[PDB]
């Protein structure tokens with residue numbers, strides 16, 4: 442979830 | 449011309465310093481690493497055919513002190529052979545020292561140290577996700593572009609003792625044989641969707657059995673049947689890949705026919721994951737070394 446390009 | 453042994457000494461000098469402490473190499477030493485390793489990449493096949501014993505590591509993402517810890521546990525080169533699965537840069541705070549160290553060991557030990565391309569070894573991705581910014585801050589944009597020309601020459605896949613297929617992302621619906629990988633031409637960016645794009649980007653999924661849609665906005669997901677078909681067609685035992693953040697540092701997929709490796713503990717400072725490295729010994733037995741968050 443850190444931003445989908447990727448938790 | 450270039451002093452490899454002195455670059456490595458200066459990179460390893462910060463072993464046991466406060467994590468985050470920089471090694472500010474000269475721009476022309478870094479350019480030297482990029483151009484010399486590129487020539488070594490181009491002289492070696494795009495599909496690596498490697499032999500055990502071998503340590504296999506997943507994503508590092510500029511966590512330089514965690515790379516130093518991996519080498520502590522596994523033995524610093526040439527004490528062990530290494531295969532890295534890509535994603536050296538972005539996210540972490542020291543992409544420059546990380547990639548310089550790996551490129552320095554590649555020049556120093558070109559038959560005992562191997563590096564695959566990840567999706568972050570693409571200009572369009574590492575521009576956004578940190579490496580451009582690290583380069584601008586610490587050196588310049590022209591050096592960032594010199595790395596681009598080096599990353600375009602990285603090999604894409606490895607086969608370890610005819611049994612373990614290694615790549616960064618995973619499989620492709622376009623992938624029919626190993627020969628297809630073999631004359632992808634280098635240097636290459638990844639300008640279109642297709643085989644090379646999928647090898648850098650695709651993901652396993654437990655809830656698709658065939659091919660599915662990828663949430664990253666690019667490439668595909670693949671299920672257990674895909675993996676099973678591929679391994680049996682090419683007479684392989686295991687897919688070793690990376691690319692995905694996993695809690696234990698390693699995670700099995702597709703009825704243990706695939707393993708994901710992530711070698712960066714406590715990713716971004718924010719996830720509480722461990723890191724893992726896969727040791728394949730001389731009799732093709734695998735073990736996992738865990739690096740704590």
Ligand SMILES: [Mn+2]
Pocket residue numbers: 535566567568616648690691692
């Ligand atoms: Mn990746």
Ligand SMILES: [Mn+2]
Pocket residue numbers: 447507509535568691692
């Ligand atoms: Mn990654």
